[PDB]
Amino acid sequence: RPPLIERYRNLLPVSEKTPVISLLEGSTPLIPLKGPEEARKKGIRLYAKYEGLNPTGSFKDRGMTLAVSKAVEGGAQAVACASTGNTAASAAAYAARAGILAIVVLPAGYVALGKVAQSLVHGARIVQVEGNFDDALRLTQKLTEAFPVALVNSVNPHRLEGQKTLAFEVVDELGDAPHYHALPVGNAGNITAHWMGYKAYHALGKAKRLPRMLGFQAAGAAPLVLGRPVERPETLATAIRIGNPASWQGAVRAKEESGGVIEAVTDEEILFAYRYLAREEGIFCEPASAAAMAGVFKLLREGRLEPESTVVLTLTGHGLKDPATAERVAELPPPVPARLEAVAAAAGLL
Amino acid sequence: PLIERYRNLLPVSEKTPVISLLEGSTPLIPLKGPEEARKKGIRLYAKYEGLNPTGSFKDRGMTLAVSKAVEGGAQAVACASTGNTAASAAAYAARAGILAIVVLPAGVALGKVAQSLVHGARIVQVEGNFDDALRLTQKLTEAFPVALVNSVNPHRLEGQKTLAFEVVDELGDAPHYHALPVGNAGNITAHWMGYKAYHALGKAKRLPRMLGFQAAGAAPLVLGRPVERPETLATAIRIGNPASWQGAVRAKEESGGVIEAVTDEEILFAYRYLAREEGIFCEPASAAAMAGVFKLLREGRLEPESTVVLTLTGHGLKDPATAERVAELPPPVPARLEAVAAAAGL
Ligand SMILES: *Cc1c(COP(=O)(O)O)cnc(C)c1O
């Protein structure tokens, strides 16, 4: 696992003066999937780029390594965001690695300790303000303008450049870009970066073809499917519970230029794919990440994937990011006497 | 795949069905410090096993144990524990299309087994104690087509030995010292096996001194006798009678290393240090390895200019309870730039 910035140095906005703040993120496994049967019946091969195996458990590490490295190169004493999720955790981990502050501004009483616990252990400075979520974003902006603090939010150009490397790794591995590439779409910075990576590698000549990007959003938070912002987003897939994507334009360009789509999958569909990956492929990912697999199931049922094609799915986060969704009251059989036969019977071996 | 990468050094053949989640090949992250180490030119590297498919190094052993189990036509794998072994076993069982059985004493925080459950593991609770569950799992794997995938399965040790191969492959040689946590001691046994094997190959031009560490409240190998009431927030190494006891002692003696204890406070300190200073979030049991290095460092027991590798066994995401316990949310401040800057430490 080389530092991501070093693996693609000549293709990234870095110089010899750029301080490489790396946790050896990237270079994640591209697991060939066994099925599903719907796909095998048509010679369609699926590969899961397992981004949950990045340092903080999310693909965001790809963008953060570059963003914090550049921030430091600029003399920044800290980075900031107004996120309560995987962004804050990634920012905090890299800030810690750099020896600088990670600042997260949020409306008081909004988040639970459990959700920001990861970023806090990394020493994140979480500032709850007595105001609205608009007050937090705003105060964040001014912090970035009055002090040496870099904003590492969704639109940070460096986060997008770093996230582009995922496409590079896929082509390096497969020998070419896949026919299709599915992934979840929240603020849409990831699908925008994926498309950037593919176009860049294509121009470089390492990728002969360009994949059709397949973006999927939860039905309850599908502004890019609906073609309008969603004021009241909702879904068990927290990572993509977004009503106004920050990289809206980037997503639409990626979709259009790649000849792809951005469609919706229901929470039931997301939950189904979530279970499928865990029980059938042995891959535990976040519900939002599962949306990508739900998306492939959807198009397979609709007969919209060409036979004999290759499909790559970016499973964005690790299942451990959201234990709650995995801890529904199990309702396990009652205990059995400490007798072997009883045990084998309970284990279903008889 | 790990099994393919080290095919010639593992007990496999063309007949072995490879059940892999592409585990292994984890990052060997060079640590910035601590200062105590920089002071003596002692370089530290963290082999981050928390980035394996299920979040712990055990996947190294599980891929081999399950693959061999299937080679023998096993209809299932089983273990008498909660936590990482259960989760790793369940994930690979799912991958292979066979059952994962987890036998536990009756009377169980779903968090201890939620990860194995999401993979579809079958939990069987028996009305008896820990020994009854283990005794029953043993008899179960002897009578039925079920492989026992606990710390003493020989295939798990062989698979886990690969960690040493990778460390040598990347550094270009074996390190002067290799620290890691010790629960059932299968991991330290495997690490030594790996170094010995690479030594026979000429890959390692030196043998590292193995430095094992246990939580003070669960340090049987440090006390020379079993602990009937093991205690420690470091759940993964809260083991009173290590199943791979002799293997550990041999690793310690033959390598000229040690197996010492660190307190829960020292473990939390190392845990905070890794995340806050190196940006590495690991499970508390894993931090005991860094705690151990901190200990020998202040005792002046690590040769200057030497290389020290630490196996951080699991990912911090494995233990949210401890993370929440350590985390603290500051009180709200007014929504004013000066109040925010002040609180952000600017
Ligand atoms: C941030 C995140 C997303 C959403 O990605 P965008 O670039 O906002 O579209 C999806 N899944 C996970 C696990 C994430 O962390």
Ligand SMILES: *Cc1c(COP(=O)(O)O)cnc(C)c1O
């Ligand atoms: C299993 C485990 C240990 C203990 O390893 P032993 O082989 O039992 O010595 C330590 N840390 C983690 C994260 C583990 O999963």
